[PDB]
Each structure stands twice: as C-alpha cells, then as structure tokens.
Amino acid sequence: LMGGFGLKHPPPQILIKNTPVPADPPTTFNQSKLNSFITQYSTGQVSVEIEWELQKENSKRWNPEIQYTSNYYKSTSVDFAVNTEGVYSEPRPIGTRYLTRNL
Amino acid sequence: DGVGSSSGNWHCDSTWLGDRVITTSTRTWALPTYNNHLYKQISNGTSGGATNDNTYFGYSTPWGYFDFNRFHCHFSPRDWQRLINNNWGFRPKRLSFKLFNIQV
Ligand code: NA
Structure with a gap:
C-alpha cells in the first residue's frame, strides 16, 4: 500500500x-x-548494483506528452543539489506517471 | 500495374531502434495545370513604386515540385518531443521517396 513491488522472496536482510x-x-x-x-x-564502503528491465513506450498519441522538467527561470539555488553549507536536498516529490496510455 | 490496382499503400509511422529513428509519412496531394501549360518570362523592375532592392528576372514554369524540407513533415509533435528530450544530437542519413495511386 505504501507503494512498490510486493515480493514473496524480497532482497534478504x-x-x-x-x-x-x-x-x-x-x-x-x-x-x-x-x-x-x-x-x-x-x-x-557499501555497494549496491541493481539491474532494471524497462517497458518502452509505444504510443501513437500525436500531441506532445507531459514531462517532468527542471524550472526554467533563475533561482537562488539548483533543485536537487547542495547548499552553500553543503547540504543536499530534494525540493519536491517526483512521481512516475508522465507518459499516457489508453485504457 | 492496372486501372483497378492500387500501386502503393499508406505508410505513416515512426520506429526507434537505438541510435536510429526512422520516420515515414504519406500525404494526399493535388496538382493543377500551371501557367496554362506554358513557360512565362516574369520580371519586376523599378517602375511604378517598385524599389531597386526588389528587382528581378526569371521564369514561371508549367511544373510543380515536391517539398518536405520542414521537420514536421516527418516528426509528429510527440516524436519531436521524444527526440529533443533525450538526445544531444541527430542527423539525416538516407531517404526513400514514392509517388503512387495516381489519378488524372
Ligand atoms: Na528539477
């Protein structure tokens, strides 16, 4: 319910x-x-490598789609970067549903 | 090749293969008789109010011509978006052209 993949045999602890x-x-x-x-x-140190399979988009939608984009105009700092203090931050939640699909 | 047989199908599509993308577009056209089948000398001088910067001499012909020198002739808006949002560059490699299902 919090979102994600439900696995009977998930990555081990x-x-x-x-x-x-x-x-x-x-x-x-x-x-x-x-x-x-x-x-x-x-x-x-610790390393984690994961291989992900992608399902490519196959749409015949004529007009452009909605897309996640960085802001265009000037700003005090860069979104998803560090502070003048060296602090990294995630300005907003980023979902996954931009492309569209018919029912 | 007969009166009752189509001489080509409608090919309109796009396929992305990796470092390549192939666009394909078909359109229906109409061609009238131009210049009454004639070639005509056309000119524009400096008389009347016509300025010198616009003078010219040439000819109009009874012929028409095909032109697809415009990106939207090949890329749909969505395809253009797929192109510009993910590639640092692109360029034309080769093309095929076809005229068919002609009717006078
Ligand atoms: Na951003």
Whole structure:
C-alpha cells in the first residue's frame, strides 16, 4: 500500500555488527559474562548494483506528452543539489506517471 | 500495374531502434495545370513604386515540385518531443521517396 513491488522472496536482510572485544578481564576466574569492553566502531564502503528491465513506450498519441522538467527561470539555488553549507536536498516529490496510455 | 490496382499503400509511422529513428509519412496531394501549360518570362523592375532592392528576372514554369524540407513533415509533435528530450544530437542519413495511386 505504501507503494512498490510486493515480493514473496524480497532482497534478504543484511545484518552487520562489530564483534565485542573484551577489555582486560579479572585475574581470577569468575562465572559472570564480561561486561567491560574496548570502545570501538567501524566504517567502510557499501555497494549496491541493481539491474532494471524497462517497458518502452509505444504510443501513437500525436500531441506532445507531459514531462517532468527542471524550472526554467533563475533561482537562488539548483533543485536537487547542495547548499552553500553543503547540504543536499530534494525540493519536491517526483512521481512516475508522465507518459499516457489508453485504457 | 492496372486501372483497378492500387500501386502503393499508406505508410505513416515512426520506429526507434537505438541510435536510429526512422520516420515515414504519406500525404494526399493535388496538382493543377500551371501557367496554362506554358513557360512565362516574369520580371519586376523599378517602375511604378517598385524599389531597386526588389528587382528581378526569371521564369514561371508549367511544373510543380515536391517539398518536405520542414521537420514536421516527418516528426509528429510527440516524436519531436521524444527526440529533443533525450538526445544531444541527430542527423539525416538516407531517404526513400514514392509517388503512387495516381489519378488524372
Ligand atoms: Na528539477
């Protein structure tokens, strides 16, 4: 309902975790689980490549269609670009239904 | 080739194939008799009010001619839109021309 493709076997969940690294333990044995760990975090890159199949348009509509377009006249900033502060932003929601089709 | 047989069909279409697009258009035309079948010397000088910048000498002929030197002769509005919204450029490669289903 929120939109999209419903899949019985969707892309799998990808779980990740930093392995706990004990800080020095006591010198004489104790049953209790360790609760003192070295403070750490991780970082790295991640890549996702997806192949999409397109269904080309085959319309005999004579007149031009509606199309998503960038604004023409001057503006303080560029839509879908960064700030003077380096902040990226999406000015508006962009749908998918521009071309038309008969029923 | 007979009186009762069409000598061609109506081909009007467009197909996009990759780095190519083929346009095809057919139209119905009418051709009258021009100049009463004659060739005539036509001229315009500097008499009356006709300025010198517009003088000329030439001829009118009994012939007509086909012309399709205009993009809309080949691209429908939608096709033109498909072209200009997605390509950095384009150019003509080859053409076929045909005259048929002639009736006098
Ligand atoms: Na935009």
